[PDB]
Amino acid sequence: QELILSEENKTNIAVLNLGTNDRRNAVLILETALHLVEKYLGKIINTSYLYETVPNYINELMQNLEESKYEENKELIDKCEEYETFLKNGKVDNSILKEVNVENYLLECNNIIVKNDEIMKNNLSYFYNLTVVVKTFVNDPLSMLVVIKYIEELMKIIDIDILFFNDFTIFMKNIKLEKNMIYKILSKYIHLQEIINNMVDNIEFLSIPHVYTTHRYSILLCLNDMIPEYKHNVLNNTIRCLYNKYVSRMKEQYNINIKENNKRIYVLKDRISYLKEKTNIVGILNVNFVEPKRAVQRMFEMINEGASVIDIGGEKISERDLVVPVLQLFQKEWNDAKPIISIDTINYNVFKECVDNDLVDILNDISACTNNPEIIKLLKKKNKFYSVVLMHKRGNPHTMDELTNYDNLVYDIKNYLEQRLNFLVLNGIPRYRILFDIGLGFAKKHDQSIKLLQNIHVYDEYPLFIGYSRKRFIAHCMNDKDQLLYQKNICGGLAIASYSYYKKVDLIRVHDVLETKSVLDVLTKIDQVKDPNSSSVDKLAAALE
């Protein structure tokens, strides 16, 4: 029916998929896609990691944008009843369009697949995937597909698909819609040329769940980040059981590791970083009757020495007055290879200032955003996203050394950080921008800092940032005296940089950049093997000769 045009206010759970081919810009494309979804369909309440897979224009686009009909609510939530119901597949409101049963949908899907498996063989590459969950006002899959496709076309590089829409098992075989009919929907949601019309030659049909959901690995990989316990009526198993069977088959039947080709990504500023492929040095700038010029020159010194990131903090004279001048002075000389800037603050107003004057890229929040959850709001703009380091601790520096009793040290801390991540994600922080920090020395005995490093592998799936530099637990490892201990303590840290390099820790926050960079260069050199076969080829040549 034409119920489609009713303002009768409802909320649906819509799982999307976003794709692109530009490697140099995948972030800029895909995050822009996100904003539009946030602006035109409802609220992003889950994302996956950004994955790489093998199977000036936009600046002015944001200035000239149409207002949405519905209003953008930036308020923090801690639960979403709709999402909760979606996941268990309990009853949400009935489907607008007609629903096809299990067996019909199953066969009509084989139709589209073999018809494409035929085309592809007669037709004789980088893929950047990213699932999303939307809490949507939009009334039905088709209405969404329309808006989705108008969104796509506004951006012309990008392919946005619906993967799920509530429990709905919808297959529609032949679809066409009028040119004014399209305008009517696009006006139900947007306050409104040679790009509108185009949609009619497309929009040939509508499959929910999307046809290739179970079939393309990259999809099942993203959905495993978000909704692994999900079991759609169509599907024989949960997202995770499906995902896990797919992987143990590509292994047993192809003798090939699928994760070697499809690579999890995280983002510090705007560029791609492959999870576990490099240990970035994050140089510490601790501002301490303060020559800002010294500080800004130390920033340059550290850049030269090898730092990919600068972590500034001051933690009477206020913190704001200790760091903003410096960042402004720095921002200037750079306009007279650019290092990513991290601010070590828990203070909302200081980050806001820094973020409004574009002086920083990452928030380093040692309270894991629990001092002031509102700070999470500052990591979003219309067209901007900032990344964040969440660190574990207990108490403050006066009391933390005594707050040391844990039911399960390793897993308590990991779960803690996992719940924070979920919280930020549930609030539209992109999963791939959230970095984990175990907080060495913060409410841990020395043995516990070590036990934490010993068990750092529990972070294999996640972007990891750690700070050991110059901490007391290093001294605990050892078997003019004050000068020795500071020589010993820096060298001890160098051992942890080595350990970190082998454990593939993504970022290490250090005082001594020169030193750490030397260590990491030698270790990288040793690992850079020109022929990965040579050891056994050369072994055999010697047995033969």
Ligand X SMILES: Nc1nc2nccnc2c(=O)[nH]1
Residue ranges of the annotated binding site are: 38, 42, 72, 149, 152, 159, 161-162, 202-205, 207, 210, 212, 216, 512, 515
CA gap 66, 423 in Å, rounded: 30
Radius of gyration in angstroms for the set of CA atoms belonging to the chain, rounded to a whole number = 26
Contact by Cβ (8 Å): 421, 434: yes
**Distance (Å, whole) CA 128 – CA 117:** 22
User: Tokens for 19?
Assistant: 């794709």
Choice between 40 and 442, CB closer to ligand X? 442
Restricted to residues 471-510, the positions that interact with ligand X (CB under 6 A) are: 509
What is the Cα–Cα distance from 5 to 188, expressed in whole angstroms? Answer: 7
Confirm if 455 and 410 have CB atoms less than 8 A apart.
yes
Q: Which of 31, 161, 311, 512 binds Mg ion (CB under 5 A)?
A: 161
82: contact with Mg ion by CB under 5 A:
no
Pick the binder of its own copies from 88, 180, 484, 533 (CB under 8 A): 484
403, 394 contact by CB (below 8 A): yes
- Sequence-separated (6 or more) residues with CB below 8 Å from residue 371: 346, 365
Retrieve residue 525's tokens.
């050199």
Give me 202's structure tokens.
Answer: 């497309």
Tokens matching residue 131: 């699932």
Go through the chain and tell me how many residues it has. Answer: 545
Identify the residue among 43, 135, 210, 509 touching ligand ATP (CB under 6 A): 210
159 binds, among Mg ion, ligand X, its own copies, none (CB under 5 to 8 A by kind): Mg ion
C-alpha 396/C-alpha 324 separation (Å) is 24
Q: Which of 467, 492, 517, 519 binds ligand X (CB under 6 A)?
A: 467
Work out what residue 43 binds among Ca ion, ligand ATP, its own copies, none; the CB cut-off runs from 5 to 8 Å by kind: Ca ion
Residue 150 in tokens = 């108008």
Q: Report how far Cα 98 is from the mean position of its chain's Cα atoms.
A: 36
Query: Residue 161's binding partner, choosing from ligand X, ligand ATP, Ca ion, none, with beta-carbon cut-off 5 to 8 A by kind?
Result: ligand ATP
Among ligand X, its own copies, Mg ion, none, residue 38 binds (CB under 5-8 Å by kind): none
Q: What is the DSSP string of 291-327?
A: -HHHHHHHHHHHHHHT-SEEEEE-----HHHHHHHHH
Rule CB under 6 A: choose which of 50, 391, 417, 497 binds ligand X.
391
Pick 382 or 539: Cβ nearer its own copies: 539
Which segment (154-162, 188-196, 262-270, 524-532) binds ligand ATP by CB under 6 A? 154-162
Strands, E, within 429-537: which ranges? Answer: 434-437, 465-466, 507-510
Q: How far apart are CA 296 and CA 350, in angstroms?
A: 19
Q: Which stretch binds ligand ATP (CB under 6 A): 65-73, 203-211, 279-287, 348-356?
A: 203-211
Interaction of residue 30 with ligand X, rule CB under 6 A: no
SS3 call for 362: strand
What residue has token string 């030397």? 518
Q: Measured from the CB of residue 364, what is the shortest distance to ligand X in angstroms?
A: 5
96 in Cβ contact with 140 (< 8 Å): yes
Closer of 203 and 234 to ligand ATP (Cβ): 203
Query: Dihedral, CA atoms, 26, 32, 36, 38, nearest 10 degrees?
Result: 90
Residues within window 212-251 making contact with ligand X, judged by CB under 6 A: none
From the CB of 126, what's the least distance to Mg ion, in Å? 16
Which of 72, 84, 93, 204 contacts ligand ATP by CB under 6 A? 204
| Site stretch for its own copies (CB under 8 A), options 54-62, 68-76, 213-221, 471-479 | 471-479
Can residue 392 be called a binding residue for ligand X (CB under 6 A)?
no
Q: Which C-beta is closer to Mg ion: that of 159 or that of 418?
A: 159
User: Smallest distance, Å, CB 389 to ligand X?
Assistant: 5
Contact positions with ligand X (CB under 6 A) in 505-534 = 509
- C-beta of 213 vs 273, nearer to ligand ATP: 213
CA 7 to chain centre: 34
User: How many residues make contact with ligand X (CB under 6 A)?
Assistant: 11
Q: Of 186, 363, 389, 425, which one interacts with ligand X (CB under 6 A)?
A: 389
Residue 417 burial (CB count, 10 A): 23
Using CB under 8 A, list all residues that contact its own copies: 306, 408, 410-411, 414-415, 450, 453-455, 457-458, 474, 476-479, 484, 487-489, 491-492, 494-496, 498-499, 502, 514-515, 517-526, 529, 535, 538-539, 541-542, 545
